[PDB]
Symmetry: D2
Amino acid sequence: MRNLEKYKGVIPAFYACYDKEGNISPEGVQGLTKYFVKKGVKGVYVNGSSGECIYQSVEDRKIVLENVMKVAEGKLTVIAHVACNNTKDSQELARHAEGLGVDAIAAIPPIYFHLPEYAIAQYWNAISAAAPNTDFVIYNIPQLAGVALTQNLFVEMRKNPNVIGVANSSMPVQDIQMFKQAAGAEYIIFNGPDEQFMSGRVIGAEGAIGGTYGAMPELYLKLDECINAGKMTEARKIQYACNEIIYKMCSAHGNMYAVIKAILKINEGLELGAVREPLPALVDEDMEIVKEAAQMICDAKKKFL
Amino acid sequence: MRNLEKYKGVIPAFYACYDKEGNISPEGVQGLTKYFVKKGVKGVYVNGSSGECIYQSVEDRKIVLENVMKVAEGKLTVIAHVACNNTKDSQELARHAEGLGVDAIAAIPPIYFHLPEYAIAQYWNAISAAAPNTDFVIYNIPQLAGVALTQNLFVEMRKNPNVIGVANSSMPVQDIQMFKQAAGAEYIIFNGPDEQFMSGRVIGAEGAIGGTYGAMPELYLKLDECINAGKMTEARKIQYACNEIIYKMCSAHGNMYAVIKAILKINEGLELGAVREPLPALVDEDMEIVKEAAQMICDAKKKFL
Amino acid sequence: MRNLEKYKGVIPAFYACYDKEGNISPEGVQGLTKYFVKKGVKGVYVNGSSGECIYQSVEDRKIVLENVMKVAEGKLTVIAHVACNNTKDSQELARHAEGLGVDAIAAIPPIYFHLPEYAIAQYWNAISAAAPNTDFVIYNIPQLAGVALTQNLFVEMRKNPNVIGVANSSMPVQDIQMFKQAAGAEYIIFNGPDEQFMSGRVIGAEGAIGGTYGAMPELYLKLDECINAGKMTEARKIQYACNEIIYKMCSAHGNMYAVIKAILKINEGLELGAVREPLPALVDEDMEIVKEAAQMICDAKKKFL
Amino acid sequence: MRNLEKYKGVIPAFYACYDKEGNISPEGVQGLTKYFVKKGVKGVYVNGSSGECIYQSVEDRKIVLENVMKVAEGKLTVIAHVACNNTKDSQELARHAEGLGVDAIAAIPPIYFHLPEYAIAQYWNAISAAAPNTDFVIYNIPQLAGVALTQNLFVEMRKNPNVIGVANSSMPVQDIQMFKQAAGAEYIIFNGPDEQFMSGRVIGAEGAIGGTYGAMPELYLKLDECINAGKMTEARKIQYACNEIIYKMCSAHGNMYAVIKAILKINEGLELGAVREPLPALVDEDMEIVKEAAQMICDAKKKFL
Ligand SMILES: [Mg+2]
Ligand SMILES: [Mg+2]
Ligand SMILES: [Mg+2]
Ligand SMILES: [Mg+2]
């Protein structure tokens, strides 16, 4: 009965867009937003870790979301990741995001220290209470956060009526299946590991949020079309092509998001700036990998679209 | 164009069948083998860890395989897991299995100590050399063995022409995708995590070896039929029903395989005996869980077949 | 040989001192600094994770360090932990700390994302270059940061002449031994795990930085006196009493640092405020644990001093 | 109060002694036993993983212990590690060991599968009941077994009056401290990680069982003498020399125990045979490392004895 159709489809993570001085670029943010509208994705996931949120200030993240919403509002579903190291910064971003009329806010767990489940629930509920009219997505990423969304913690969080589901970036597709089986029809699970897109989708994730989607959004849209059509052979071919490109982008000395920003300059003429330190920048030796990955994306689009 | 069709389908792990004194029961083994023939599964995976191989002697494992082959030969594909703690016992079982005409032998890595990749390759190659006319399957289970089949170790093992692929029991379906992508069309990957059957299958596992399949083989056959037909909604319904049964069986005090042997007595009149210590036996309180799981299996068969 | 005597001894982690509104309290910070001067510890480790640095702004951390330096009167070795999520905030705190004439700056690795060793070295070297006249301590805490100071990364970092050594919070005392053996006499290793103080000290840590020291600094000073005298029976008595107190403080619902601030109100009349969310606050049921731990500290001081 | 003085001191792990055909050598076992008597160690720990027990049959392990007991002449404390993959083989070895009058039997936990604590306790108690008049040592090695001796499981095991303590090979010396603090004076903790010998000893391990001791037993006896005298600087020098030798021995292609057997041929003229496959054998390139480590041991003995 709760309507979650606006979340069903391909929702790329929005990248950090910087100017030449390394500050957030309003023009760069608007340009990348126009790119996502033109590519016909379902939505954008803004100021996630793929958007370098770990490395941004509250003010940086407000400027990014304001500039996304100037272009995207009414055209894309917008999920704003608002978690910060502390609760008060997270509440400030939640209130700001509700003020702009985002569809949902999201939060990773507390990081660095491994906090008990009651403290994790308190953090998410405090963030949710700052945006009390806004859908809330839990982002499960135990490999990086150091704590997991357990089945017991998910039961506790489903007591909050704003919680709509889970963006799952743990590696077991079993976790998707268990969260969806426990929660039932009024919740959505998003597939987080792009390399497993087709496998998380078939086992019950009806949404998909990914850090590599922005490099090749047409391929993930075509993958999703094949899955919805039961064309599993064609879906596998596209998944394998996407994964080969991911492995190529991850083979660079510079960070994978540095590779993606360079690819989008080659393939689209988009200027997204550098990646923020401490993420490592590309070196000269990486430009052959960038060029190869960019061409692999063009070749896969020609093969599959 | 190596022909691996005989490995493509549902291959249950064969359970340990004991008499009342706790020794291997030839009659019990033949009974369980006739059951798998009657259920029309593709093959059986014999003396794996689901068959309590960690807890069996070389002589025990010879008696099991002899009694399986008496019923199964020419009816079922037979894969004999031959790995033991040391190399010489593994070579003895490999030679014995080739002497009986199994389709393939299989091996987990060395366990307990974490041995370097060259020592892992030497162990597998020594086992393969003792069955030099027999297909060889690597069993990847890093969570239990403590070492993984890495992409570099798989490159080295593909130099052995008898290696036909990998039974993958790591949790990431990404591992299935990467092994299949690296190896190509002349290799098969088997899905190991039963809870992820449909997800591993769609991303490129053309076989499936599972410890829970013997409790409910018709449900996994029906799941596989749905997947091959592109009927992903029906596949998901069956996967969810199978996983609910697995979670019920795992809720007991006694070991999951003790629950399955008790279910097979209720549902099929099969007498497989106890589980071998140190695996924990059922307690009286577990029989309500056994009865509930057995009824769940009957109800799923009535719903889905 | 480089003189590191000012770092040898007991250097408590400095706690976050808040007012009733949860902001940094200048008067609270000065109070806690004068407490450490009167207890005769060697120094203080300021704005570490035990000081809630994860949860503090750059401005918060500047206010803390300014108020320490205002009242320390040169009586304390001051190590200022300056690592932030991003490099530019870390460089800002490094420059600020050198401007106040701290003895050393310190840095955990980059967190959340697992960055390659060249990126970790670039982060530390960038922070060090912002305080180019200041001693630099690497803080190794792989359990929380998700990356380790490896032997190869330590070789690279010893190329920077400002690096004086490692605060080691990994659990193996082998790591202390290996870092000390590799580096030699011109470097200092600080023991991080308070529960292993005597064990890390004897195997080559000549310094000690600890989150629990501020609850009971006289006990750690007396432990260190026993170790330096070769009085290992007396040292073990104190270590066991300290560890029992730590286990009692960690038994609370509220965060261990919340327990310590409540203990310091009982035993010292110090008002340090709460802990910052998301760290969980004490509940009513915890005050029995707080009072028991406070009494255990008083009784240990009567037994051992 | 239970007298555990016979367990306090240096107890080397006894190596596997093979003939040229790779079977257990009765003459080789007697020779290595007489070597340990000559070197004046407190005892031997027989058929542990350093003795290649994972790779031995029940019959192999009986032959080893028979030949130790034949020539020890009451001069050594004998701890017989009797754990096997299954319970019945473990019970057979426990009964055999009690029949020879060993001082203690020992057991690692169940391996490969991760069994619940009640199943671990059942395994140890079944082994102990087969040697009901014999002291029992729990061997904690979570890194290899995949399960830990938790504080709760140790409480349960202290209900068995034959349990005398724990050989602790987990890396935190905190685990030694917590086991000793819980158990008190009628129990002994043995330090397992040889690289941490002096640190485990000072925090409350009164015994020490080590796989590298047999390469250089005089150095560990001299280390223990320095610790008992409170001479921590002299102790640290010996610990560092021992650790440098361990790191050299572990730098070979062949397994560390293969390097130690080759060193004992050079330094002592002992013939212990190969290591059992799958442990990797030395290659020609390793003989320079063997000779260097053998010389390092001679040089350390000249410096410290
Ligand atoms: Mg990177
Ligand atoms: Mg069990
Ligand atoms: Mg806490
Ligand atoms: Mg080795």
